[PDB]
Amino acid sequence: MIPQTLTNTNLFIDGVSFAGDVPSLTLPKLAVKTEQYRAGGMDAPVSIDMGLEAMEAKFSTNGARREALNFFGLADQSAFNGVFRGSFKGQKGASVPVVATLRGLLKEVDPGDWKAGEKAEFKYAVAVSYYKLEVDGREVYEIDPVNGVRAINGVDQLAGMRNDLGL
Amino acid sequence: MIPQTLTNTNLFIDGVSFAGDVPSLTLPKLAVKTEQYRAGGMDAPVSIDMGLEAMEAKFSTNGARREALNFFGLADQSAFNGVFRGSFKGQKGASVPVVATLRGLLKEVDPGDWKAGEKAEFKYAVAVSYYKLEVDGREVYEIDPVNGVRAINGVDQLAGMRNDLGL
Amino acid sequence: MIPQTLTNTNLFIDGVSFAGDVPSLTLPKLAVKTEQYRAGGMDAPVSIDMGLEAMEAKFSTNGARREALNFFGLADQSAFNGVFRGSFKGQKGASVPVVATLRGLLKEVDPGDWKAGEKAEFKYAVAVSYYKLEVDGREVYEIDPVNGVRAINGVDQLAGMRNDLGL
Amino acid sequence: SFFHGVTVTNVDIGARTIALPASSVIGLCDVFTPGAQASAKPNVPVLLTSKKDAAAAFGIGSSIYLACEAIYNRAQAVIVAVGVETAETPEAQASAVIGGISAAGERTGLQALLDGKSRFNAQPRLLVAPGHSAQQAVATAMDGLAEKLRAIAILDGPNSTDEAAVAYAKNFGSKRLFMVDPGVQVWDSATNAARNAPASAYAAGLFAWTDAEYGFWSSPSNKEIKGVTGTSRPVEFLDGDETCRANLLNNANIATIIRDDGYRLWGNRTLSSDSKWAFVTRVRTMDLVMDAILAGHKWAVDRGITKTYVKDVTEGLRAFMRDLKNQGAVINFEVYADPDLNSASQLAQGKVYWNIRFTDVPPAENPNFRVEVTDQWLTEVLDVA
Amino acid sequence: APGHSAQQAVATAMDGLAEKLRAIAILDGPNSTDEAAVAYAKNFGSKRLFMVDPGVQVWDSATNAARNAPASAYAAGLFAWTDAEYGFWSSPSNKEIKGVTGTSRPVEFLDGDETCRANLLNNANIATIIRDDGYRLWGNRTLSSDSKWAFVTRVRTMDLVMDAILAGHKWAVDRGITKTYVKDVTEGLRAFMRDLKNQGAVINFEVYADPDLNSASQLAQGKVYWNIRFTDVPPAENPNFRVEVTDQWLTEVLDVA
Amino acid sequence: SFFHGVTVTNVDIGARTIALPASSVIGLCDVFTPGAQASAKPNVPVLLTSKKDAAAAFGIGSSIYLACEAIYNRAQAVIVAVGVETAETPEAQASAVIGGISAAGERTGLQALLDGKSRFNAQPRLLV
């Protein structure tokens, strides 16, 4: 392979670009909910899946930025839309985009300490109700809890439970 | 003995080589599940074994690397195969390979903070359903929870419980 | 007295010497199991003994070292034998040996993170089922939980409970 | 051809004989006829684990099989058995049971039991020659081979009186000999009467049964002989400083069979002239403390001498000796390297010495009841009070 | 030479060629008794000979029975196996012969100053196979008439300390003699000899140029001498257990106390 | 001959007598019988470090060994011991324990303890 690393990030909240004031992004940690399964005739657990964990995407701005402050605590959950973008560089110069469109509830706004000479950072966190990760313009993840979809290469892994539940 | 130390690592996920972008590997911590056993006629516990603990192998990439992102959260648990390799050097120059083929469920994908000038590291973790450690091409460990096998020098330690349970 | 300090360590697992690759040893922490005893006619607890705590000796190698990897998780608990040795120097040059023969179950093998340029350290831990500490070739401690023996200067402190229990 | 489906077969098989599976090995030597169904060459030892394996190698009417049935009724033991062919005169029969190296180079008779290990991995800890140990020549070949093989030979006297047993027991002052004089009277199914049996094999099946349930340090001296209906002579265990037949034979260092249609092996003295080695508990424990010590320290004959060779053996010897104090074989052992005889001139020859003192558990040979009838509690009750 | 080293002419050609090739020849006796092995072992007082008398009885798959085998090749596979795991200085004298089901004669290792068959053949400098359906090669004396060269540990270590010294100092036959030729060999010899003390082949070697025989008349001929004294590790041939049954701890326990 | 493999040997040895190893040296002088197993000339000092070394040089029934067993039960000390041969009368016995230069030129009795250093590098700090 080629040594490849992120060099640049961007954020689109509602189509508006945050191309001056987002120092840090955080994509949601996709964790499956394992239960360590030890049963008869075996000495070690085996970790069956039980569904996904709850996803939170957090991000920080350090200006005022009403274009992200006005999405806190709306009555409409899953109305914060948002696109986390990253450019992964690579040694040969072939920049690969990593774009994570996501949707949910902006669940906490954390204006930190305001010291005078120190940079003040508004920390936000969203409660992700839809998540699609595209790498090099190709769908890697697509997670929609309601309308239960877990696509991993465009392949919906939950077609098994969908016919079982009659969804 | 000879002073011997790892110098180089490698990773094969599904035969594909990650020979450019895995900065850190972690073999699963093999811990036996002890219960401290204090009973009649004795002043100190003695720690009987109760089987093995749950094994997790974690590893990090810091490029995009769909060849490891596409194994998260599949319906098929124990479908992530994977080979952790290490080269332990030695002072006299006799490099000893340490190769740990393992199999399980890629249970969490943790894209960390994305700051602009900072290296962004995807942290992964697998839930190990099969583990074989070979050192210098010789089987040290072989742990398969279902089909209960715990081989320590090629010697299956669970042949005692296998005949007792009628497995 | 004379200012005296450890300068060198060694490890024998099964008679084999680890005289190249054990950077750290740890003798088991001998803690007595106190219960803070406050009762009638007294303002402060007094800490009666209730027996010894569980002993764990841990040690690390940082080569491959199958001669310690092949003792993990055997069916035979208390089959890991092992001799922790130390040389305490002293200012006048009279080196005093501190040798701790011990026996138990090698209960966890912890191969840590494997980064490329960084030294990789296998951390082990044994669950001590027998422990004898000799200082300057003279028995200080001798702890055998089954066959309850707690000798402190060659003097078995548990001869009192041994006749009471009819052991 | 073959068969598919389930067969039923009317076949008489005689009332199974469940026994505890024992780990002790027994060296057996008696007469049989080499025929068609007997698949054993005469002076060749064979390993036995079943009454079927005893009746396939030897004849079912043989005297080997009657000795092997005598052991399998009590313990499912491993038997290295040597089928000495029969002979006319008892001088030539005792010469054939003893045997020797009188072949081209092979070992015959009792001497083939020294081949029990390296042929079958079964080095016989018990030596029995049923019906032949009554001769004084065989019982000396039993003696010198029990000293070599580090075993206990189980002898037997004649069918005659008590004085013929006492006078035959004065011919031996050996530690490894254990005489059981009164023969077993066992009911034969064929003749529908009580057949005699020399009772040495019934001792050896119980001697190996005691290792299974009670351990090798326990005495076999009150345990139950199974498969027997009586003794050849009634043996009399009574009290009162008397001439009891069980007490006469114990004082000649002979075990007997004492109660209830021949129910229990009785003595526990070996035929030793030394009071330090009086009990078979002392002889068997010292013999099998080392066989556990040796088989367990086979790494000390290779593994060229390093600095901590002598230390890693002591802590290995102490570890396989606190396992023996744990289960009750010894009481408070002592293991240490011999400080006076570990030279470097000895170490260049490969010699290095250790001292393995221990204390054996004593058998409760004589419980003493001092009983008294008093009129002390004649007022405490039986009164208005 | 399996099956052929029982003849006394072949076992002398094995001898003189083991002296040339600097090896250990592994002989074997006949199928006959112990005395035919002892009397055949008195024909040799050579350092490089290692007799294993009892043949191997190995189960043949074709005939579905136990075929005999002359047991010299089973010794040589174990002699070379010991170099892999334990090193060439270790003795092969308790290691496990694999692929075998028994010996041609049952060999008897017992104690008690007796006429044990394993002890009779060791005192004639013959290795045997002693336990458990023919399980372990047993002796470690070579057929030498010199007590300085009794063990094969002594013969194999001295043979393969030099084969590591020589194959590793192949630059000393070219490289015409400069001033520090003799110094660069000693520090080269000491460096490839502290690698041997490290892994346990020797204990406290001594290497130095011979001060009395390094003339200049020798140096014009290209000759230059060195002294490579060392001490070999002794094999633990006879561990001795002095066991005693006491009544010392008959009061310390078994009492009201 | 030799032996290969492990021997076991039933042998009575009497209940070991562990003591702290001491650095002091002791000058000892008592009676013994010069016989076969006693490998000591009478008026010659010998260095002792063990009860075995006391019973190999002197008799186990000697009065030297009873004095040396008396020391080795408490300290593993170095003993320069001079085995003065026995005599009939207590005037001649006390004359033989004192000793002197009454040889050709040698030193006998207690006077041989002055030879303890330069024979064994043990100059006796305790005289008994």
Would you list the DSSP string of E60-74? ETTTTEEEEE-SHHH
Residue from the list E106, E111, E112 with its beta carbon closest to the beta carbon of D118 = E106
Q: What is the DSSP string of F5-65?
A: S-EEEE---------EEEEEEEEEEEEE---SS----TT-EEEE-SHHHHHHHS-TTSHHH
Contact B92 E195 (CB under 8 A): yes
Distance CA C138, CA E28 (A): 51
Best residue in D322, D330, D334 to probe C by mutation, most C CBs within 10 Å? D322
Strand C24-26 relative to strand C80-88, pairing? unpaired
d(CA D78, CA D72): 9
- On whether the CB atoms of residues C65 and C117 are closer than 8 A, the answer is no
Cβ burial E115-131 (10 Å sphere, 16+ → b, else e): ebbbbbbbbbbbbbbbb
CA distance A167 to D256: 85
E200 lies within 8 A of chain B by CB: no
Q: And the tokens for B133? A: 């450690």
Which 205-244 residues of chain E touch chain B by CB within 8 A? none
DSSP state letter for D99: E
Whether E24 and E18 have beta carbons less than 8 Å apart is answered as yes
Q: Which residue of D has its CA nearest to C104?
A: D319
Taking CB atoms and an 8 Å cut-off, how many pairs form between chains D and F? 22
| Rounded Cα distance, D182 and D164, in Å | 11
Asked if residue F25 lies in contact with residue F116, where contact means CB atoms within 8 angstroms, the answer is yes
- Cross-chain residue pair C130–D311, CB shorter than 8 Å: no
User: Is the alpha carbon torsion for A147, A153, A154, A159 positive or negative?
Assistant: negative
In the DSSP assignment, the letter for residue E55 is: P
Angstroms from E61 CA to nearest CA on chain C: 34
| Interacting residues of E242 by C-beta distance below 8 A, sequence separation 6+ | D338, D353, D354, D355, D356, F9, F11, F13
Nearest CA in chain D to C148: D326
Residues F82-119 as b or e (16 or more Cβ within 10 Å = b)? bbbebeeeeeeeeebeebeeeeeeebbbbbbbebbeee
Domain borders along chain D are 13-273, 274-362
Q: State chain D's maximal CA–CA distance in angstroms.
A: 94
Burial of B75: CB neighbours in 10 Å, binned 0-12, 13-18, 19+: middle
Distance (Å, rounded) from C-alpha B26 to C-alpha E71? 48
Token representation of residue D383: 């009164």
Q: Kindly report the three-state secondary structure assignment for every residue of E180-193.
A: CHHHHHHHHHHHHH
Task: Give residues with Cβ within 8 angstroms of C104, minimum separation 6.
Answer: B47, C55, C57, C77, C78, C80, C126, C127, C128, C129, C130
For residues B118 and A8, give the distance between their C-alpha atoms in angstroms, rounded to a whole number.
9
- CA-based nearest distance D89→chain C, Å: 56
Tell me how close the Cα of E195 comes to any Cα of chain B, in angstroms: 9
Contact between residue B66 and residue C108 where contact means Cβ atoms under 8 Å apart: no
Distance CA B129, CA B149 (A): 12
Asked whether D30 and D132 are in contact (CB, 8 A), the reply is yes
DSSP-assigned beta bridge partners for residue A139: A134
User: What b/e sequence results for A130-158 when a residue is b if at least 16 CB atoms lie within 10 Å of its CB, and e otherwise?
Assistant: bbbbbbeeeebbbbebeebbbbbbeeebb
- From its phi and psi, is residue B93 left (phi > 0), alpha (psi between -120 and 50) or beta? left
- The distance between the two most distant Cα atoms of chain B, rounded to a whole number of Å, is 64
Residue with tokens 């991995």, as numbered in its chain: D121
- Taking the mean position of all CA atoms in its chain, how far away is CA E229? 20
Check if the beta carbon of residue F21 is closer than 8 Å to that of residue F76: yes
Do residues E24 and E155 lie in contact, with contact meaning Cβ atoms separated by under 8 Å?
Answer: yes
Query: B64 — contact with chain E (CB < 8 Å)?
Result: no
- As given in the structure block, the two tokens for residue E243 are 């066991």
3 state SS of E245: strand
Give resolution, Å, one decimal. Answer: 2.9
Interatomic CA distance for residues E245 and D276, integer angstroms = 9
The Cα B65–Cα B18 span in angstroms is 9
Interfacial D residues in 118-147 facing E (CB < 8 Å): 118-121, 147
What is the tally of structural domains in chain B?
Answer: 1
Give the per-residue SS3 of chain B: CCCCCEEEEEEECCCCECCCCCCEEECCCEEEEEECCCCCCCCCCCCEEEEECCCEEEEEECCCCHHHHCCECCCCCCCEEEEEEEEECCCCCCCEEEEEEEEEEEEEEEECEEECCCCCCEEEEEEEEEEEEEECCEEEEEEECCCCEEECCCCECCHHHHHHHCC
Distance CA E14, CA E76 (A): 14
- What is the torsional sign of CA B136, B141, B143, B149? positive
Residue F29 token pair: 């002088």
Q: Does B66 touch chain E (CB under 8 A)?
A: no
Interface contact A34-B165, CB threshold 8 A:
no
Using an 8 Å Cβ cutoff, are A57 and A28 in contact? yes
Which residues, other chains included, contact D265 with Cβ-Cβ below 8 Å and sequence gap of 6+? D180, D202, D203, D206, D220, D221, D222, D223, D225, D255, D256, D257
Question: With an 8 Å Cβ cutoff, are B92 and E198 in contact?
Answer: no
CA distances (Å), origin E126, targets A66, D177, D318, E141: 96, 34, 34, 7
Tell me the C-alpha distance between E108 and D341, whole Å: 28
Nearest to E104 by CA among E8, E3, E1: E3
Question: In this structure, which long-range contacts are made by residues B156-161, counting pairs with CB atoms below 8 Å and at least 24 apart in sequence?
Answer: B157/C73, B157/C74, B157/C75, B158/A43, B158/C75, B160/C75, B161/A43
Nearest-Cα distance to chain E for C110, in Å, is 26
CA C109 to chain centre: 17
Report the distance separating Cα E130 and Cα E143, nearest Å.
19
* F10 Cβ under 8 Å from any chain D Cβ: yes
Cβ neighbours around B60 below 10 Å, total: 21
* Pair of tokens at residue E50: 């290692």
Residue A8 at interface with chain B, using a CB cutoff of 8 Å: yes
Contact in structure between B99 and B85 (CB atoms under 8 Å): yes
Contact residues on chain B for A133, CB-CB shorter than 8 A: 69
Residues D84/D42, Cβ–Cβ less than 8 Å: yes
Of B113, B150, B167, the CB nearest to A26: B113
Between CA D88 and CA A107 the distance in angstroms is: 107
Cα separation, E164 vs D135, in Å, equals 65
The CA-atom distances, in angstroms, between E111 and each of E116, E238, F7, F35 are 7, 12, 6, 34
Q: What are the tokens at B145?
A: 């929870």
Q: How far apart are CA C158 and CA C139, in angstroms?
A: 16
What is the C-alpha to C-alpha distance for residues D144 and D99, in angstroms, rounded to an integer?
13
Quick one: tokens of A83? 């696109």
Sign of the C-alpha dihedral computed for residues D285, D286, D292 and D293 taken in this order? positive
* Spatial CB neighbours of D199, under 8 Å, sequence gap ≥ 6: D156, D180, D182, D183, D184, D231, D257
E90 interaction partners in chain C (CB closer than 8 Å): none
Decide if F16 and D334 are in contact by the 8 Å CB cutoff: yes
Which pair of structure tokens corresponds to residue A128? 């992700």
Q: Is D1 on the interface with C (CB under 8 A)?
A: no
Q: Alpha-carbon distance A63 to E235, whole Å?
A: 80
Contact F54, F48 (CB under 8 A): yes
Rg (CA), chain B: 19
* Token pair for A116: 């005078």
Between CA B81 and CA B71 the distance in angstroms is: 9
List the determination method. cryo-EM
F18 exposed, middle or buried (CB, 10 Å; 0-12, 13-18, 19+)?
exposed
DSSP E145: S
Residues C130, D306: C-beta atoms closer than 8 Å: no
DSSP string across F88-113: SSHHHHHHHHHEES-SSS--EEGGGG
User: What residues of chain C lie within 8 A of the CB of B32, using their CB?
Assistant: 72-73, 105, 107-108
**Which residues of chain C have a CB within 8 Å of the CB of B4?**
20-21, 62-65
Q: Nearest-CA neighbor of B66 among B24, B102, B21, B96?
A: B21
**Mutation for testing the D interface, residue in E249, E250, E254, E255 having most D CBs under 10 Å:** E249
Question: Measured between alpha carbons, how far is D96 from D99 in angstroms, rounded to an integer?
Answer: 5
Instruction: For the beta carbon of residue E253, count every other beta carbon within 10 angstroms.
Output: 17
Strands across the sheet containing D152-155:
D45-48, D75-85, D20-32, D126-128, D152-155, D177-180, D254-255
CB contact residues (below 8 A), chain A span 43-62, against chain B: 43-49, 52
Tell me whether residues B150 and A34 touch, CB distance under 8 A. no
Q: Is the dihedral of CA C122, C123, C128, C134 positive or negative?
A: positive
* Residues in chain D within 8 Å Cβ distance of C81: 315-316, 319
C45: number of Cβ within 10 Å: 12
CA distance E119 to E108: 8
F101 CA to centre of own chain: 21
**H or E stretch at E153:** helix E152-166
Of B4, B135, B150, the CB nearest to C69: B135
Chains B and F: 3 or more CB pairs within 8 Å of each other: no
Tell me the pairing of strands E25-27 and E49-52.
parallel
The letter for the amino acid at D384 is V
Determine the residue among D285, D302, D331, D352 to mutate to test chain E binding: the one whose Cβ has the most chain E Cβ atoms within 10 Å: D302
Chain C contact set for D339 (CB, 8 A): none
Pick the residue of A21, A33, A47 with the most B CBs within 10 A to test the interface with B by mutation: A47
B2 interfacial to chain E (CB closer than 8 Å): yes
Nearest-Cα distance to chain B for C105, in Å, is 8
Q: Does C130 touch chain D (CB under 8 A)?
A: yes
d(CA D91, CA D224): 35
Scored b (16 or more CB within 10 A) or e, D223-245 reads bebbbbebbbbebbeeeeeeebb
Which chain C residues contact residue D311 at CB under 8 A?
A: 83
- Rounded CA-CA distance A66/A72 in Å is 10
CA-based torsion, E11, E15, E16, E17: positive or negative: positive
Crossing angle of helices D309-327 and D280-294, rounded to 10°: 140
How does DSSP classify residue C14? S
Q: Are C11 and C84 in contact (CB under 8 A)?
A: yes
> Which domain, by its residues, includes C54?
1-167
CA distance D199 to D222: 15
Reference B152, options C119, D313, A43; nearest CA is A43
- Residue A75's region, left for phi above 0, alpha for psi from -120 to 50, else beta, is alpha
Closest C-alpha to A129, from A115, A140, A118, A143: A143
Chain F residues with CB-CB distance to E250 below 8 A: none
User: Nearest CB to F10: which of E122, E243, E248?
Assistant: E243
Residues of B in contact with C122 (CB under 8 A): none
* Residue F68 DSSP SS3: helix
Within the 130-149 window of chain B, which residues sit less than 8 Å (CB to CB) from chain C? 133, 135-136, 138, 140-141
Contact in structure between D32 and D64 (CB atoms under 8 Å):
yes
Instruction: Give CA torsion, residues A22, A24, A30, A33, to 10 deg.
Output: -120
Which tokens hold the place of D316? 């290995």
Look up tokens 């540990």; give the residue: E153
Pick the closest to residue E130 from E105, E150, E148, E153 (CA basis): E105
Is the CB of F50 less than 8 angstroms away from the CB of D301?
Answer: no
C163 touches chain E (CB under 8 A): yes
Number of residues written out for chain D: 385
Neighbours of C38 (CB within 10 A): 11
> Could you write out the DSSP letters of every residue in D160-185?
S-HHHHHHHHTT---TTEEEE-SPEE
Residues 76-115 (E) with a CB less than 8 A from some CB of F: 93, 109, 111
DSSP secondary structure string for all residues of A82-131: EEEEEEE--TTS--EEEEEEEEEEEEEEEE----SSSPP-EEEEEEEEEE
C97: closest CA of chain E, how far (Å) = 22
Asked if the C-beta of D259 comes within 8 angstroms of chain F's C-beta atoms, the answer is no
CB-count exposure of residue D314 (10 Å: 0-12, 13-18, 19+): middle
Kindly state whether D338 is in contact with chain E, defined as any CB-CB distance less than 8 angstroms. Answer: yes
Distance CA C92, CA C4 (A): 9
Question: If you search the block for the tokens 């009397």, which residue do you land on?
Answer: E39
Beta strands (DSSP E) in chain C are 6-12, 24-26, 32-35, 48-52, 56-61, 80-88, 96-111, 113-115, 122-135, 138-144, 149-151
